[PDB]
Structures are given as C-alpha cells and as structure tokens.
Amino acid sequence: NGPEITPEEATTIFSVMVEWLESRSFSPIPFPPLTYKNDTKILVLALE
C-alpha cells in the first residue's frame, strides 16, 4: 500500500518546521570537522 503520508499531507507538516526554524533563526548543525575542539571530551563521554 505504500507510504501512508500522502503528498498533500506532507507539505502541511514539513511547512511548519520550515517556518519555525526560520522564525527562531536556527543555524544548521555542521558535520564534525577533522580538526575539532572537543573530539576528546566527546569520545571519553561516549565510551565511558
């Protein structure tokens, strides 16, 4: 039966997020860079 979300339904959803983030002025999260400050602190946390 395929995905149940229906194209018309989807635009309504996706549009809300798009306005919210822009309203809120939200910069997107980047990809973790090869040289990154906190790589150590976030490995130790994660492995422990």
Among 11, 39, 42, 43, binds another protein (CB under 8 A): 11
| Shortest Å distance, C-beta 43 to another protein | 14
Query: In whole angstroms, what is the distance from residue 43 CA to residue 32 CA?
Result: 13
Residue 8 gets the label, from left (phi > 0), alpha (psi -120 to 50) or beta, of alpha
Among 25, 29, 45, 47, binds another protein (CB under 8 A): 29
The two structure tokens encoding residue 44: 């130790």
Binding-site ranges for another protein (CB under 8 A): 2-3, 5, 7-8, 10-11, 13-15, 17-18, 21, 26, 28-31
